[PDB]
Each structure stands twice: as structure tokens, then as C-alpha cells.
Amino acid sequence: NTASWFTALTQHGKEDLKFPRGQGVPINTNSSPDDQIGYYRRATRRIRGGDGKMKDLSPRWYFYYLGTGPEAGLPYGANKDGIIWVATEGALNTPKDHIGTRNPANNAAIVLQLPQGTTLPKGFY
Amino acid sequence: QLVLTQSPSASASLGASVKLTCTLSSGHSNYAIAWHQQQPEKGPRYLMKVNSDGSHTKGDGIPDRFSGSSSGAERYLTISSLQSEDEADYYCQTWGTGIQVFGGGTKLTVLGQPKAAPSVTLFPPSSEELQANKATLVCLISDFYPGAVTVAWKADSSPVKAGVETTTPSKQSNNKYAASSYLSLTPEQWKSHRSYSCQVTHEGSTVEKTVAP
Amino acid sequence: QVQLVESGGGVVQPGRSLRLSCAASGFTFSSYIMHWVRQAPGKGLEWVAVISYDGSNEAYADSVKGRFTISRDNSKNTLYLQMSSLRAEDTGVYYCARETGDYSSSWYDSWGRGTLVTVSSASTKGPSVFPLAPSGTAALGCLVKDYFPEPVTVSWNSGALTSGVHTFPAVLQSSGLYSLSSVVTVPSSSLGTQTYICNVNHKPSNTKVDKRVEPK
Ligand SMILES: [Zn+2]
């Protein structure tokens, strides 16, 4: 049994998730910078709307490290609907077999947290 | 996708304390925010940066009665010993690479302030305006609380409603309200009645000022 | 003390262009990132644009991209916003703001006073000014009638008279024009010794009126 290591991102508009270049990989203290690369995969639930007609809810997006999860066979950057690639500077373009996916029986999801940059590069950058 | 949610309003009693809430959208529960205060008819003022671990850093000149805290995706501004000056819209601000985001703002109202009766001054049309073939009566109303009044005009003893322009009361530097009412007349109207009156009613009580040609 | 002073607001026809400026003092201008922020009447704050220390980098809210630019003159301590293809929803107060010098964050630590931008077909109209002659203390004033847009500044005796002055908020008339009054409370014994002049400035129309107010 398999799951994203992280909780989902809720998309609030109509547009797909977008991330600044070099951002989008969830924070994870005990992670190597070689590993900071993967994809978000969209999931959409449907329920009845206020008019009784089936409708889509806000899509949720789940992160998977590169080479793991439902699209473990996709190479980084491959175009596919419902898939958003993200990578941090210095990440290695290699499958993250050792990280794999989360077994929900043994671990709860890690709260997905993104980095917070400055509006423009400043300070040392 | 980076969104700050604030409730539109809040209220608490004078001298009491209030807690305002800003909520970060999903995936940003680790972000720091800043709180800004915008007093009525004023630009904003930086209050405080609040971090996700609950710590906060006041700006210079911000009183100790303002503090900040945090829990999960929620960021709080706590104001104790509430004073009249604390009525304002409060905005949370956050930031990220390439972006700058504000909440919708929370309007804070501070209940139980002391009643204060209006001061009323009524001016007749100037000689110069009449010589330009116009006539304006100027009714000036200050120093009242709460900030709701009723203004009624009279020609002699008859109520007049046409040609009246009255402002919405707004808070002044001394934390009481001011308002204005203007009555437009022809010079002949002005000269042909015995007097004109401005009646200001506030929290029950009415006063009336009167001017004559 | 850090100060930010915005200028250049006024009336602009839709589709036209307008440049705002912000004069900074009290700190080393070239050491700080500077932002523009706006507020439509009765709505919230909305970020507009950001410019780096030396003007080499910039970014824009999606709502103004391709229409507004931001620029900076460090020698003259001034920040600008060039606005073009203006639409009615650009109307509002525009604020200059200083980003903290903190290396790791981008909160604003200082705000300007704001300048009003009015995107409309209505024409600019300067006020007519009439004295409100006085009847311990007497109240005397100036009526500032029929102008557009806000704001008007009133001073008294070119600024030397300040104690006792109350300038009231303007009324918006059904004609679409504004009027306001300014009153100053003085000692009765001063009437006849002291000259009282109110100085009215309506920048959007370059109207500058001084009206003497004498007892009746
Ligand atoms: Zn959410």
C-alpha cells in the first residue's frame, strides 16, 4: 500500500498549480539536496452541487519524488495532464528508489510545507 | 494559490482585548506574515512580523499591548487594553518569490466608548456668494460620539428637504465624529424668510441653531 | 525619521497614461527595495509592483503587467510608477512602501501617505472660495465650493495660524462635485487687530486661492 509522503496541496483557482523555478519541492529536514525533485499529481473528487448535478471539487495535488508513485515511469519534465514537475537547484535527475512512497499503515503523512522566498532576490542573493 | 483569509469584522469593548486571525492557504503553514493597521482616512502603519513558531517582532513605537502568536496555518494579532485609537482596518501581509499578498482586512470596532454631544455652528451665505447669485447655509457638527446624527433643516418653522447635502460622520483626530450639512437656496429665498435653522439630533437629544438675513 | 511622499495623482481619462512619483527621505534610499501598493475606494490593499535596490530587477502584479512599469532615480531619491492603458478599476489611492532591510523577508516597514488616481471622463474643476465671517472666542471660516476631484488643502495665514483650525471632510454632492469648509476658532478681541486669510490649494486644477475673512 502506497501514498504520497505528504499531505495534499489544495488548488484554489481554475488554473493549475504554478511554482517559481527552483521551488515546489516540499520542505523536509532530513532530505538530501540530491533528492529535491519530483512531481505533483492532481486528484479531483466529485459530489453533488447546489443544483443537484454532479460537479468537481477543488483539485488536490500530491507530491511524489522523481521515479516513485503512480507516474514513477515518467522522466522528469515529461508533459502529461495533471502532472507538474518541480526541482530544487542541485537535485539529481535520478529515480529516488530509496525514498519510495509512504505506507499509510506505518506512517502518517508529513504536513506539506513550501519554502518562503523574498519577493525579489536580496541579501546574499 | 498563496492566499490570506481574514474575517471582515471584529468587535470588543473598550479596555478589553481582541484576537484577530489570518489564515494561510495550504502548503504555506510555515510562512511568516506581517500585520498592518490602517486607521480611518489614513494610510497604513506596520505593526509586527509574526513567525510560524509563534514568536513576533514589534515595529518601533508599537505598544506592548499589541502582540502576535501562531498556531498551524493561523496567525494572530492580539490587542489588549483596547482604546478608541485601535479602531481601524487590520491587514495581514505575506510574501514569496515574485509575489506579495494581502488579506482582505478586518475592521475592528471598539464598543462602550463615552457618549459626547455634538457642537453645532451654523453660517449664513456670505455677501460674496449672494452677489454671485447663489446661497449656501453651512451647518458644522463636531465632537460627537457615537458617530450617528440626524440633520433636519427648517425655513422659518417649515421642514425643508430639497437642496440638502449631508456628509457621513467620520472620526476625527480627537476620536469624536464630525459631519457637515449644506443647504442650497436662491438669494431671494434666503432674504424672504425670517430665518433658517439647522436641527441636529444625536442619541435622543436635539439642538437647533438659527441664522437670519 | 523615514518619510515617503507620493505625488502625481489626479484625473486621467480611460486609456490614457499617468506617472506617479514618491519622494523618499530620512534613510539611504539606494539601500532598500521599494514597492507600489494600491487601494480602490472602500476595498483592501493590493500589491502593484516592486523594484530592487539599483533598479536591476523588478516584478509586477498580474493585474498591471504589461501596462504599468516601475522605475527608480537613486540620485534624486525618487520612485516612479508609469501607468498606461488606464481602466476604471485602476482608480484608487496608490501607496509607496519600503521593504524591510531584513535579508530573509519582504514585509513593509514604512508606508507613504498615498496619492489618489481618478480614472474617469469627468473634468477637473477648481473651487470657488467664500469667506465665512464671524458672528470669549469667535468662529470664522472658509467655504470651498464645487471642486473635483479630492483633495483640497486649506491653511490659514500661509501656515502661521494652526491652533484652533478644523477643516471638515468634504461632502460629495449629487452633481458629482465636492464642497468642504474650514473653521478656525480665535479670540474675539483679535477681530480687528488680526488678519485672517485662508489659503486654498486644489492641485489637480492648479487652483490656489487666498480669501480674506473679515467681521460682518
Ligand atoms: Zn486551503
Short mmCIF file of C-alpha atoms in Angstrom, two decimals, chain A residues 9-10 12 17-20 23 27 111-119, chain B residues 1 3 25-33 94-100:
data_model
loop_
_atom_site.label_atom_id
_atom_site.label_comp_id
_atom_site.label_asym_id
_atom_site.label_seq_id
_atom_site.Cartn_x
_atom_site.Cartn_y
_atom_site.Cartn_z
CA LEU A 9 -2.00 20.95 -1.83
CA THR A 10 -5.41 22.45 -2.48
CA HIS A 12 -7.89 27.49 -5.17
CA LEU A 17 -0.60 24.97 -9.68
CA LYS A 18 2.39 27.08 -10.68
CA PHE A 19 5.67 27.34 -8.76
CA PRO A 20 8.67 29.67 -9.10
CA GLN A 23 10.68 25.77 -5.91
CA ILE A 27 10.37 21.03 2.88
CA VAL A 111 2.44 18.23 6.52
CA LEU A 112 3.36 19.66 3.13
CA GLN A 113 5.30 22.91 3.63
CA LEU A 114 6.81 25.07 0.88
CA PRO A 115 9.76 27.45 1.23
CA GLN A 116 9.10 31.17 1.56
CA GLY A 117 11.40 33.26 -0.61
CA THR A 118 11.81 37.02 -0.74
CA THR A 119 9.80 38.88 -3.39
CA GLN B 1 -2.68 29.87 -4.79
CA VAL B 3 -3.99 33.29 -0.21
CA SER B 25 -3.60 28.75 2.27
CA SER B 26 -2.49 25.13 2.03
CA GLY B 27 1.20 24.41 1.77
CA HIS B 28 2.15 27.70 3.38
CA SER B 29 1.56 26.87 7.04
CA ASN B 30 5.22 27.67 7.69
CA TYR B 31 5.14 31.24 6.34
CA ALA B 32 5.71 34.41 8.31
CA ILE B 33 3.23 37.29 7.97
CA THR B 94 2.82 37.88 3.33
CA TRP B 95 5.37 37.36 0.59
CA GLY B 96 7.17 34.79 -1.54
CA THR B 97 9.40 34.59 -4.59
CA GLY B 98 7.97 37.03 -7.10
CA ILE B 99 4.87 37.75 -5.05
CA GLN B 100 3.35 39.94 -2.37
#
